[PDB]
Design a protein that fits this description.
- The structure is a homodimer.
- In chain A, helix 2 packs antiparallel against helix 3 and helix 3 packs antiparallel against helix 5.
- The first copy, chain A, is mainly alpha-helical.
- Chain A has one domain.
- Chain A contains five helices and no strands.
- Chains A and B meet through helix 4 and helix 5 of A and helix 3 and helix 5 of B.
- The structure holds heme C (2 copies), calcium ion (CA) (3 copies) and copper (II) ion.
- Copper (II) ion binds next to helix 3 of chain A.
- Chains A, B: It comes from Escherichia coli.
- Chains A, B: Belongs to the cytochrome b562 family.
- Chains A, B: Its cofactor is heme b.
């Protein structure tokens, strides 16, 4: 599961959550996203391939995933309570977490 | 203040953070946005003036500001720490969040 596969998994499950019909289906997609993010966090992006692994830039990159994961966890709390709509809206605001790391690192 | 003035505070102080040279300027600008975000959170926006205060439509409106304040706080830490270029880049990233709430209720 290389980084590009993890990104597709994130991308694919956003679509799943948008057309989901109950909070349990959003929960399932959010959990798959959450593991794809933690798996993605392990990797090194191409835009930093020759920088040092312990660099400030690799830690900034790794922290972008903690910011995304914490949004996923906030959405998971709504899904687990059955608030399908509110959790669907939550998953929509993940888009900015995707973008904030994308600018400087994609 | 009313919602529009708070928004003016948010919009002008973003540009100020963009043009500031030192950390005391970013911090001062970030602090005004924080109070304006928390004050705007209490308002009802026109495009929702006929719904009811505990709808998932206006749950979403208030939660947008908790998330905005959280990122202003990330930027304030960096400023307080003296990383002007990093606080300036934290603050530029708020606009994705601005535009997301805007797409819905502006
Ligand atoms: C950093 C902390 C990131 C976060 C959060 C998200 N993404 Fe990402 N994404 C990132 C990088 C460095 C890259 C490039 C990797 C490469 O090998 O080029 C990507 C790429 C994508 C892609 C395209 C993948 C490809 O085929 O090259 C997609 C579709 C994508 N990212 C989607 C996506 C979504 C939906 C996110 C939030 C839910 C998201 N990413 C977060 C880095 C980071
Ligand atoms: C919801 C959670 C919002 C967030 C986050 C931000 N804004 Fe906003 N904004 C919101 C509404 C409902 C409105 C319309 C209010 C109205 O009475 O029309 C706005 C409007 C603005 C405007 C226009 C102000 C005007 O001239 O009438 C500006 C310039 C603006 N907002 C800026 C702005 C910025 C820079 C933000 C984040 C950094 C931001 N807003 C966040 C709702 C929400
Ligand atoms: Ca690539
Ligand atoms: Ca459907
Ligand atoms: Ca106006
Ligand atoms: Cu965020």
């Amino acid at each position: 599961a290389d980084l590009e596969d993890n990104m597709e998994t994130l991308n694919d499950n956003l679509k799943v959550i948008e057309k989901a019909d109950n909070a349990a289906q959003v929960k399932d997609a959010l959990t798959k996203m959450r593991a794809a993010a933690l798996d993605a966090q392990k990797a090194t992006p191409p835009k930093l391939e020759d920088k040092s692994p312990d660099s400030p830039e690799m830690w900034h990159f790794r922290h972008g995933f903690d910011h995304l994961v914490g949004h996923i966890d906030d959405a998971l709390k709504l899904a687990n309570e059955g608030k399908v709509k509110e959790a669907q809206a939550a998953a929509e605001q993940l888009k900015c977490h995707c973008n904030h790391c994308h600018q400087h690192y994609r």
